[PDB]
């Protein structure tokens, strides 16, 4: 997904520019700040996620997603979830949305 | 000179009395401004508030009821509780209505 | 979770750890060790509450086992003493029994 | 003198006291609230409608002289002021004037203020444009 | 706020009633009187 | 404080 | 504040790693690397709201939901996600989410 | 509430609360609590006639007409068609207000006052949807809702009223 | 006499366990929890195979709630208190009493709601133009009734299966006698 890269490499951007300040407050030499956007971003292509420029109880490969829920409701078997601001992972391809309508036959 | 409505009567006056029309005017809703601001805590139990009001109590020593309230958000009812285990109120002195922390432990 | 749900020791400020003290001292039938307080709050060392509770009046020292008592405002375990005592004042004002009670299992009685 | 009462002296009467104003000051208690509220009810047009009697079940129709006499109903008819409703607000800084605003909260309406009984063979009277024949046709001696 | 209760109309409706029905003008006397009908005269 | 409600004329 | 669930996203998970990493090395002050963990949830937070406009809806089952500390948790299995599109079929896929009015 | 009943000139609940702020929930129970009071000192100490019935649309519908302005003969047929409508079990558990309204703005299309369902509900209170949607049921049982004698004179044709 | 016997759609049970329970540590440890402590004060669980929900409380009380059948619900309290067991927490079975069952059935015929309205005055309550059916109040047993123009009867109040039954035979011959048409 090229919006999901997009977003990604603008992560990379704001962190590394807005973490500048407090590392010179501890006294580190800045060859680190590349350091950390090489380790950083060889660990991305690694993991291979997208293209880029560079019981009764409670008990990657696995699927997982990320997000703020603005409202959820139910009616009697039918949940119905209102999802925003999310980032989601989905047989090892990642996508971004800005909202998410989940609602699912509770049997 | 005044204007005399040529309407008919009946459709004049329904806007007048008993009328089924739901008024739709929100000039001076006082009311319904409260109304919509509204939230309550849960009891946020004893060993965490008892530990932060000394904190709000060191920041100034005349703290007010209203005030606490709005700092701590809890319920007046099991505030005052540890309040008046830990403070006291001055009614009859200047600043009235104020409570303020126990001599014995200001006096630290 | 209940063991955790106990803080560490290290509160905002110190005032609320004497106020710990003076509620436990109190729930004791007989005077508590310092070896008991420092079982309840983790300051082995001696720290500056352990002082600022003696500096109190409601809390009575005892040299011999080094200890602190709930000292109570008036010092009444029988109906004599009690008896006395109301003689012994100089005006008509009563001796609260909010805080007769204090210090005293039966009152009523 | 009648004519005169009803077309321009109840105008007049309205147009003097049309404005009430109600207060509300900062009511210093915490920074959150330092805002003054005002509030204005202003009265302008007045209308005068033809008479007309509402029954008990809220039926309102024309009245006439021949059935007012009848029915010991009085022959009066309903009068109608426009209304301005207006809230102007403002920030209230200690120890200065204040700059009140409006507030886009300006409603725009005709409130019933009640019934003017009218003296017959009046312009307000439904037998100013009656004829003779009309007249007879409404029971009413020319 | 409620407008509808805000005026009341039988101030007005009231007020002028009662000072016609009767000879009372407030809220002088004999101010009005039951016209007489007995000749075109009178 | 004030009386929270004046008039204005 | 804001939310240190998105330190378990593949950006984030990676991040640990990355600092981690560094911090066996050496190179970098413990607390170091939690401070400029605390800025990443800001930079993450500003860029997902205000820079996309893709849109997602899931269709499935739900095999489990709780609430605790205003997070919600959902598992949806056998589901169909569509994209702004395509279909995408899953076995099991696991939602989080936290309440939308940040505490403060 | 209960005076307006008791004086053959009741009123409706959305009437009242106009006047008086009160929500539905307590404004019904206080009034079923105070229905019981009544009952229970009357006998004991008439109350209620055919008039204390809840639905009793008769009386709603000349007032409803006299805020449409129309003439006193489309008030008389409406009441002829409430009168009747309450034959038809698809409408008869209905609300009072919507079986007085609807039939009022059958007539209203009957006589061709140049009235549009939108007046009518905006006037009443009443949704256009709930209007057009009691008005469908109402179009199937139109000789049964009509007055005879009117038909038979020639003032008002069923042809007249639009069909869907 | 009528034939059809109503029934019952829901019975509503109360437990209790005589021991103080956390509701965080439940509300993780359980596969389908609610527990907002900001609406209310108690953790909802709910079980697949009686398809019902519980009402578990800090103080050790519980209901139960979404049973068709008396026995049913003694077998979702039974295992709802299980699965507090299962957490670790002192969970017993002990007094189990129905507080509420509601049943439904229908009389196959309109009737007519304005007699019954007046034929029968204190119990019966028709407002309808707030509530399309009419309410009920019979005397003995004491169970309120809703009646409707379609006429369906809703049973509810009845603590016994044997008291919802005598209701419906006891208010049948007088919703007969009001058979529109």
């Known amino acids: 997904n090229a919006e999901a890269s997009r977003v990604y490499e603008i992560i990379v951007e704001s962190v590394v520019n807005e973490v500048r300040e407090d590392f010179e407050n501890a006294g580190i030499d800045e060859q680190t700040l590349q350091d950390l956007k090489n380790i950083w971003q060889k660990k991305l292509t690694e993991t291979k996620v997208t293209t880029f420029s560079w019981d009764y109880l409670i008990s990657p490969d696995e699927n997982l997603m990320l997000c703020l829920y603005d409202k959820v409701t139910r009616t009697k078997a039918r949940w119905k979830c209102s999802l925003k601001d999310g980032v989601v992972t989905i047989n090892r391809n990642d996508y971004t949305f800005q909202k998410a309508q989940v609602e699912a036959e509770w049997v | 000179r ?107 | 979770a209940l063991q955790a749900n106990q803080t560490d020791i290290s509160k905002s400020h110190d005032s609320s750890k004497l106020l710990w003290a003076t509620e436990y ?44 008592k709930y000292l109570s405002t008036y010092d009444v375990h029988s109906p004599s003493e009690l008896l006395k005592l109301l003689r012994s004042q100089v005006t008509f004002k009563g001796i609260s029994c909010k805080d007769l009670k204090d210090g005293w299992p039966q009152c009523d009685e | 003198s009648f004519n005169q009462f009803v077309d321009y002296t109840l105008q007049d009467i309205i147009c003097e006291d049309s404005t009430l104003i109600l207060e509300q000051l900062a009511q210093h208690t915490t920074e959150s609230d330092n805002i003054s509220r ?105 | 706020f409620n407008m509808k209760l805000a005026i009341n109309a039988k101030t007005i409706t009231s007020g002028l009633k009662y000072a016609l029905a009767t000879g009372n003008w407030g809220e002088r006397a004999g101010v009005s009187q039951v016209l007489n009908r007995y000749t075109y005269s009178s | 404080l004030r009386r929270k409600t004046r008039q204005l004329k | ?88 079929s899953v076995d099991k896929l696991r939602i989080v989410a936290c309440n939308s009015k940040k505490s403060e | 509430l209960i005076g307006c009943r008791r004086a053959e000139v009741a009123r409706t609940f959305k009437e009242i609360q106009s006047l008086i702020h009160v929500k539905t929930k307590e404004f019904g129970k206080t009034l079923n609590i105070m229905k019981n009071i009544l009952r229970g000192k009357s006998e004991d100490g008439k109350i209620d006639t055919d008039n204390m019935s809840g639905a009793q649309n008769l009386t709603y519908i000349p007032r409803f007409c006299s805020h449409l302005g129309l003439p006193m003969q489309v008030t008389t047929s409406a009441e002829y068609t409430a009168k009747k409508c309450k034959e038809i079990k698809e409408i008869a558990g209905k609300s009072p207000i919507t079986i007085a309204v609807v039939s009022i703005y059958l007539n209203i299309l009957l006589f061709q006052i140049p009235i549009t369902a939108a007046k009518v509900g905006q006037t009443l209170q009443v949704t256009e949807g709930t209007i057009k949607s009691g008005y469908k049921i109402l179009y199937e049982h139109r000789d049964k809702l009509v007055d005879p004698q009117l038909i038979a004179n020639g003032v008002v044709s069923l042809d007249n009223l639009p069909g869907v | 006499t009528s034939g059809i016997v109503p029934t019952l759609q829901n019975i509503v049970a109360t437990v209790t366990l005589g021991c103080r329970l956390d509701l965080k540590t439940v509300a993780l440890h359980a596969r389908n929890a609610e527990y907002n402590p900001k609406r209310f004060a108690a953790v909802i669980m709910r079980i697949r195979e009686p398809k019902t929900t519980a009402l578990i409380f800090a103080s050790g009380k519980m209901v139960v709630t979404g049973a068709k059948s008396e026995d049913d619900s003694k077998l979702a309290s039974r295992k709802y208190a299980r699965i507090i067991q299962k957490i670790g927490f002192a969970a017993k079975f002990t007094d189990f009493k129905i507080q509420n069952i509601v049943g439904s059935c229908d009389v196959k015929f309109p009737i007519r709601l304005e007699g019954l309205a007046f034929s029968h005055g204190t119990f019966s309550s028709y407002e309808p133009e707030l509530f399309p059916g009419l309410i009920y109040r019979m005397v003995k047993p004491k169970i309120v009734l809703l009646i409707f123009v379609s006429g369906k009867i809703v049973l509810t109040g009845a603590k016994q299966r044997e008291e919802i039954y005598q209701a419906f035979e006891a208010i049948y011959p007088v919703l007969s006698e009001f058979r529109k048409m």
């Open chain 7, 1 to 88: 504040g804001y939310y240190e669930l998105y330190r378990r996203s593949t950006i984030g998970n990676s991040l640990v790693d990355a600092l981690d990493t560094l911090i066996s090395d050496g190179r970098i002050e413990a607390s170091l690397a939690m401070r400029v963990l605390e800025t990443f949830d800001k930079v993450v937070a500003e860029t997902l709201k205000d820079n996309t406009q893709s849109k997602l809806t899931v269709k499935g089952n739900l095999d489990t939901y709780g609430f605790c500390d205003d997070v919600w948790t959902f598992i949806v299995k056998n589901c169909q996600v569509t994209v702004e599109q395509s279909v995408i």
């Open chain 2, 2 to 108: 005044i204007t005399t409505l040529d309407e008919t009567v009946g459709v004049t006056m329904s806007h007048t009395g008993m009328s089924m029309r739901s008024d739709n005017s929100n000039f001076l809703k006082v009311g319904r401004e409260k109304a919509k601001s509204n939230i309550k805590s849960i009891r946020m139990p004893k060993k965490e508030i008892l530990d932060y009001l000394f904190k709000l109590f060191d920041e100034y020593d005349y703290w007010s009821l209203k005030g606490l309230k709005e700092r701590t958000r809890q319920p007046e009812a099991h505030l005052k509780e540890c309040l008046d285990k830990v403070a006291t109120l001055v009614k009859k002195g200047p600043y009235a209505f104020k409570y303020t922390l126990r001599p014995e432990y200001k006096k630290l």
């Open chain 4, 38 to 142: 005002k509030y204005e009810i202003s009265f302008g047009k007045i209308y005068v409608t033809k008479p007309m009697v509402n029954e008990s079940d809220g039926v309102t129709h024309a009245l006439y002289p021949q059935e007012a006499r009848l029915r010991n109903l009085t022959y009066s008819s309903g009068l109608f002021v426009d209304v301005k409703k207006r809230t102007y607000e403002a920030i209230d800084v200690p120890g200065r004037e204040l700059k009140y605003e409006l507030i886009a909260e300006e409603s725009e309406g005709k409130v019933f203020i009640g019934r003017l009984p009218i003296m017959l063979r009046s312009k307000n009277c439904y037998l100013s444009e009656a004829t003779e024949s009309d007249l007879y046709k409404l029971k009413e001696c020319p």
């Open chain 3, 25 to 68: 001292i109190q729930k004791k039938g007989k005077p508590v060790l310092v070896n008991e307080l420092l079982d309840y709050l983790s300051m082995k060392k001696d720290d500056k509450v352990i002082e600022l509770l003696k500096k109190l009046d409601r809390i009575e020292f005892d040299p011999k086992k080094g200890t602190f």
